[PDB]
Design a protein around this nucleic acid. Structure first.
Ligand SMILES: [Zn+2]
Lengths: 189, 140, 138, 141, 65, 56, 54, 98, 70
RNA sequence: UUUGUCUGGUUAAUUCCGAUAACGAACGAGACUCUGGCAUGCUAACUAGUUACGCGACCGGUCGGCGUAACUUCUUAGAGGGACAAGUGGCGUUCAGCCACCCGAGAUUGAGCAAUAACAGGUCUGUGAUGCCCUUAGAUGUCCGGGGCUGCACGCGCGCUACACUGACUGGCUCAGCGUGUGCCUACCCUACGCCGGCAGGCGCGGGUAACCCGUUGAACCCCAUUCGUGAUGGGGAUCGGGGAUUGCAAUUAUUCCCCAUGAACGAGGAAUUCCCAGUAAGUGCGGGUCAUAAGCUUGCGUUGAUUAAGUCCCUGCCCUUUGUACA
């Protein structure tokens, strides 16, 4: 009965996509007590996918240079943000992270061609691991930039960002940029 | 925690507008000659709890702040805190506050400009005073 | 009676494990008294994973030195797990050791197997191992 | 059970020993405890004016854990990080005046003696006075 | 890249032309064979020679090289 | 008295100055190098040369 | 000249109080462990002292 | 209680002379406690290569190791002269105190 | 930002009659909709736990979490 | 003069396989030395530790608290062992190898070394290495003294510090590691502990030529509570005044430090561009250098420790093959 943070069951949450079924690692083998693993995971191609999704989530919040290297600060932030999910919405938060990452990866994208500086772009589609990590990057942007200059602190902003990609409101910078960088691939066609 | 009827939205004491919406030892920092390291021992020796805002205090303890503030040496603010510890002209131990630090500053500047010593000539010409390189830095 | 180490880094933990009525003490403080508490489950991971019945005969005293704080935590949990497995191989039968090693390894391999990564040296011409200075052209 | 300092949580125990070193009234308070900065790197005086009792509480806890220490090692324990302005930051040592006056004031109430090696240690009476306070935080949950 | 250089695959073949009655298919036997049958300086060359005579005995007994 | 490190360094400076001075005098002798061997009855300094008759 | 002002300056505590023990220069010295050579005379005699690149 | 202290810059001559000294003292069977390996001090001096400072700023790294050992034995202190007459190999030097 | 330094007369019925009907009560919750400083948020929302209409869910030096007691 | 040295596959590599008028080789690469990762197997030890004891101190537990007998797990460091694309599946002209996965400490650890031969590359300011020219006593030798390299309508580059709420300020808590230490020339040192000050410091007894003393190197960041509440604000601490101490023959053109005061742009920076692939970038401190005083630089050490790629010749350089010459 491996429970995340002591309190979260991993047994029940619903990945409703087939394409990210082996690429969101949350189910029973990847049930861990903590979002810290101190792992060796990015040492090969495709061992970084079956890092747990919570561990990738707290590492992608380490991003800017004032907060480089500091992991337990983001373990604390993700702990209070998950408690903010359980208090504001009251559903299992692992469905909120799974719904945010499944819903917010952009399914089509654009590539630059044109011999390096005349802009004619071409639309192709996205690999699912690129969709997962693009979704975590568009979810960690938003929330830090929307709690950069505010009276709102970060934990409510990040948990509301995962909520706002879990239900698909278009105040969500993950969902807003998802629609924008898929619609320019719609436009360059 | 509700505003009292004795709450002040401003103070204008010693002719600087002290805002009534800030905390007291950080409300008093506009007077040149009190900063915070002077301020917290001022409110230590004036026997006021620090927790209150600027409007929450009555006028009697506030005038105890100003009256003990002008001569702190009567009330054991000790001797190494002092702003001018040996004056050039008076030779007394003093802590000089808003409008008197300015007058003593420009008199010491103009005394340096009178007697042909180095530092006021460096002050008058437009240079850095204390030995700095101005070849690359300080351009206006 | 065993004493068997675990290390992650220049942090080095060794647990002193002999027969008793149950104990865990890391340098004289027990396992519920270590300073980082966002990492509280890492030291408790054999206690939550194996259960307190699997520790039911031993007195484990852990002595640590060196490293940082988190490397010290990761040496504490590895030294505790190696302490119980070394006691179990010497004094209990080896199928219990087989059961405890597949329940410990398959969760996380740093509980039984060390970390060979150490900090690589600075070389000249830059402030780290790989990074280099800014190299103006004109 | 038997409750020593090493078995209990160290965030409440130093404040309860500070409550005893306030409530006895036999720790002397010198004349300048209310206007001082506590090393050359800190900016301000303490928020709470009860810093002297808290500092003496932690000092006797540090003499509980490791004796054979002096003032010059008490400043090595109590250093910190100096912000230096536009220069890089530095590590700069703690004050010997506060450690000298705290350790003589803890010798004043017959709680603290010197070591045979010239530095400091606990008495049996000062050992007793800290294990009882560990016994009294041990019931408060 | 783990390509074997000239000495570890010429010296292994001149080790295999003679002394074929001692060599075999297991690496740890041939590694111990290689110090009676040669004078090799230090062991990383000797482990590389032993790895190529194990790969060559893996190749050679099902046809001509 | 003196350290182990400063003893080893100062004896190395003794080897350096002895070989440099013996090269700067003895061009004709076939000078190639010197050999120190120290026992406390007598400290022995052995010169390598191919022609001894100009060494004497 | 006069022997009360000629070389009367203190040649304690100076950059002119120390020099290379081989080549009489004072710049870029190696002061550690009692070498007192400048860096070039370190690099000539380096293996002759026993300091070996490894 | 006489302790002989060996020091060198190379390990192999020091290992031969320490083996020879303990073989000469184990053939006569005095009480000898074994070689106690004290930690090596690396003297490192990192100088710049270029004599005028013009190139691409490559740096040079020299080092020298000092290997420090001892043997300690309980004996009459004039029996101890006869063991230190076989130990006169270059490199290693012998310091004797009681 | 122009915030209250202490409570106005009709701020107490807002503090007592809107806020325990809110889903999440943090010190970042009240100050956006009240134009108050966060010091009023920390002191006043700490004082309501002695009025017993909230439950403390988490406490940290940066982030404090309260809610409705059903 | 050419082939050998290549159409191709493969490699980090003229590394190899293969084709084949070439066959066998040498230098460079690789091998090699040093370091990192493993050992309950050996050797082991008052300048290193574990533990069973014996006693003291405190309410079985705690004790780096005081001293003894067995061991070498933790410390030190030698002698050998060990990882080889070796085992398996697939791809592959079934050949070089490449990819995947178990068993395993480890399935590209990092640095030194560095060929043919050349540049009008830098250095005559490292040289009692120097060739010639120069000056050589109203010196360009050589000393003593004030001054200078520090100057500023102004550019360009290396860097540091920040533009804050993951923060700032105050208290508590707990952990490293490379190493330095009393000197031919020659005054120049690491500092325990006790007393006096709020600091730099003053004063004295001690220890140390080093695994012994500083030193369990009680390091910073990180962690846990207090306050602050988006304001050019309690961030920014630039510039600027009086005072105290240290060094030194001497601090003015403030060397350094501390006390108090003062609060400038700066709110995340445009065209161009720099650096980087696992303990890596980055955040953060501690040693070495220079040093009578000493680091916004350099050289190392550790600590907290990730996103992203597992490829291409579009760009920028470079090598090679074919090709053109009136260029050598
Ligand atoms: Zn040199």
């Amino acid at each position: 009965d491996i429970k995340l943070f002591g309190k979260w069951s991993t047994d029940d949450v619903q990945i409703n996509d087939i394409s990210l079924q082996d690429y969101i690692a949350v189910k029973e083998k990847y049930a861990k007590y903590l979002p810290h693993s101190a792992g060796r995971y990015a040492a090969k191609r495709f061992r970084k996918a079956q890092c747990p999704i919570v561990e990738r989530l707290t590492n992608s919040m380490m991003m800017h240079g004032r907060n480089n290297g500091k992991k337990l600060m983001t373990v604390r932030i993700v702990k209070h943000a998950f408690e903010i999910i359980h208090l504001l919405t009251g559903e299992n938060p692992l469905q909120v992270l799974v719904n945010a990452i499944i819903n917010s990866g952009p399914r089509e994208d654009s590539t630059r061609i044109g011999r390096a500086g005349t802009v004619r772009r071409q639309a192709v589609d996205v690999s699912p691991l690129r969709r997962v990590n693009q979704a975590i990057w568009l979810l960690c942007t938003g929330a830090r930039e929307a709690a950069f200059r505010n009276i709102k602190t970060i934990a409510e902003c990040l948990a509301d960002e995962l909520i706002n990609a879990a239900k698909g409101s278009s105040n969500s910078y993950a969902i807003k940029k998802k629609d924008e960088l898929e619609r320019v691939a719609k436009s360059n066609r | 925690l509700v505003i009292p009827e004795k709450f002040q939205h401003i103070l204008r004491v010693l002719n600087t507008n002290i805002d009534g919406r800030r905390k007291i030892a950080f409300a008093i920092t506009a007077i040149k000659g009190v900063g915070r390291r002077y301020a917290h021992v001022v409110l230590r020796k004036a026997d006021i709890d620090l927790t209150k805002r600027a409007g929450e205090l009555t006028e009697d303890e506030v005038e105890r702040v100003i009256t003990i503030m002008q001569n702190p040496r009567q009330y054991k603010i000790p001797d190494w805190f002092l702003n001018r510890q040996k004056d050039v002209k008076d030779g007394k131990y003093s802590q000089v506050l808003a409008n008197g630090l300015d007058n003593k500053l420009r008199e010491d500047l103009e005394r340096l400009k009178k007697i042909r010593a180095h530092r006021g000539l460096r002050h008058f010409w437009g240079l850095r005073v204390r030995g700095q390189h101005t070849k690359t830095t300080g351009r206006r | 009676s065993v004493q068997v180490f675990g290390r992650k880094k220049t942090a080095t933990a060794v647990a002193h494990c002999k027969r008793g009525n149950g104990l865990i003490k890391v340098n004289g403080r027990p396992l519920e008294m270590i300073e980082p508490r966002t990492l509280q489950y890492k030291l408790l991971e054999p206690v939550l994973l194996l259960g307190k019945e699997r520790f039911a005969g031993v007195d484990i005293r852990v002595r640590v030195k060196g490293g940082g704080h988190v490397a010290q935590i990761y040496a504490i949990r590895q030294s505790i797990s190696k302490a119980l497995v070394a006691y179990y191989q010497k004094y209990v039968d080896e199928a219990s050791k087989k059961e405890i090693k597949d329940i410990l390894i398959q969760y996380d391999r740093t509980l039984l197997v060390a970390d060979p990564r150490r900090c690589e040296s600075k070389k000249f011409g830059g402030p780290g191992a790989r990074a280099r200075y800014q190299k103006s052209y004109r | 059970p038997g409750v020593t300092v090493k078995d209990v949580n160290q965030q409440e125990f130093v404040r309860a020993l500070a409550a005893f070193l306030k409530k006895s009234g036999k720790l002397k308070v010198p004349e300048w405890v209310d206007t001082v900065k506590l090393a050359k790197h800190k900016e301000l005086a303490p928020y709470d004016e009860n810093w002297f009792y808290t500092r003496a509480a932690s000092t006797a806890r540090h003499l509980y854990l490791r004796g054979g220490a002096g003032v010059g090692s008490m400043t090595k324990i109590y250093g910190g990080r100096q912000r230096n302005g536009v220069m890089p930051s530095h590590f700069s040592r703690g004050s010997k005046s506060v450690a000298r006056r705290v350790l003589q004031a803890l010798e004043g109430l017959k709680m603290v003696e010197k070591d045979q090696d010239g530095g400091r240690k606990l008495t049996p009476q000062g050992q007793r006075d800290l294990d009882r306070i560990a016994g009294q935080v041990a019931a408060a949950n | 890249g783990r390509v074997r250089t000239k000495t570890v695959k010429k010296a292994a073949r001149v080790i295999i032309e003679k002394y074929y009655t001692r060599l075999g298919n297991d690496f740890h036997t041939n590694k111990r064979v290689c110090e009676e049958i040669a004078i090799i300086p230090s062991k990383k060359l000797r482990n590389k020679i032993a790895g190529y005579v194990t790969h060559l005995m893996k190749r050679i007994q099902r046809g001509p090289v | 008295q003196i350290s182990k490190k400063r003893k080893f360094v100062a004896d190395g400076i003794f080897k350096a100055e002895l070989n440099e001075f013996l090269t700067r005098e003895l061009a004709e002798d076939g000078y190639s190098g010197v050999e120190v061997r120290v026992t406390p009855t007598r400290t022995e300094i052995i010169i390598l040369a191919t022609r001894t008759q100009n060494v004497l | 000249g006069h022997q009360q002002l000629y070389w009367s300056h203190p040649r304690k505590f100076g950059q002119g109080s120390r020099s290379c023990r081989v080549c009489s220069n004072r710049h870029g010295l190696i002061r550690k462990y009692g070498l007192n050579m400048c860096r070039q005379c370190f690099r000539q005699y380096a293996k002759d002292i026993g300091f070996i690149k490894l | 209680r006489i302790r002989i202290t060996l020091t060198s810059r190379n390990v192999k001559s020091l290992e031969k002379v320490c083996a020879d000294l303990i073989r000469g003292a184990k053939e006569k069977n005095l009480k000898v406690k074994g070689p106690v390996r004290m930690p090596t001090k690396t003297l490192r001096i990192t100088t710049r290569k270029t004599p005028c400072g013009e190139g691409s700023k490559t740096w040079d790294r020299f080092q020298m190791r000092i290997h420090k050992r001892l043997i300690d034995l309980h004996s009459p202190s004039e029996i101890v002269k006869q063991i230190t007459s076989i130990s006169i190999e270059p490199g290693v030097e012998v310091e004797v105190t009681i | 930002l122009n915030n209250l330094v202490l409570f106005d007369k009709a701020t107490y019925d807002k503090l007592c009659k809107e806020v325990p009907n809110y889903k999440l009560i943090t010190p970042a919750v009240v100050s956006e909709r009240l134009k108050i400083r966060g010091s009023l948020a920390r002191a006043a929302l700490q004082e309501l736990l002695s009025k017993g209409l909230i439950k403390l869910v988490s406490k940290h030096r940066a982030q404090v979490i309260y809610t409705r007691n059903t």
